């Protein structure tokens, strides 16, 4: 029979592309970080984190 | 200067170059921070840059870095 739910267990919801936007996003934080701390801090002045 | 232990002319002008280069080492660690606390974000480490020639000159004139004891008392170091 179909009792409670065939095919509605869980298998519905993929979490991949969520888990690779939050690490683009998390990459891109790093980008801008090391752009604001080597291009602001670096204009005349030393190199960023070195 | 009390006790009248005659200082030359020469010296004289030395301790004058000494005391119109302090003008400008008052001027930048003024200014510089002033800058610093009006608004100016930037030139913060600008008068920093400028000023380290002041460093060179105190430090190959009498002292270490502030030129310490370049006034003896018959004259200068």
């Given at each position: 029979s179909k009792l409670e739910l065939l095919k509605e267990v869980?298998?519905?919801?993929?979490?991949l592309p969520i888990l690779t936007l939050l690490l683009g996003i998390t990459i891109e934080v790093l980008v801008i970080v090391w752009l604001e701390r080597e291009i602001s801090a670096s204009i005349q002045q030393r190199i960023g984190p070195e | 200067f009390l006790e009248n232990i005659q200082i030359p002319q020469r010296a004289s002008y030395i301790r004058v170059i000494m005391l119109e280069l302090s003008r400008i080492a008052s001027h930048l660690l003024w200014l510089g921070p002033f800058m610093a606390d009006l608004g100016?974000?930037?030139?913060f480490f600008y008068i920093f840059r400028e000023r380290e020639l002041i460093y060179d000159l105190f430090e190959a004139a009498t002292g270490m870095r502030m030129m310490h004891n370049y006034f003896r008392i018959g004259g200068v170091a």
């Open positions: 869980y298998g519905l919801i993929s979490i | 100016a974000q930037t030139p």
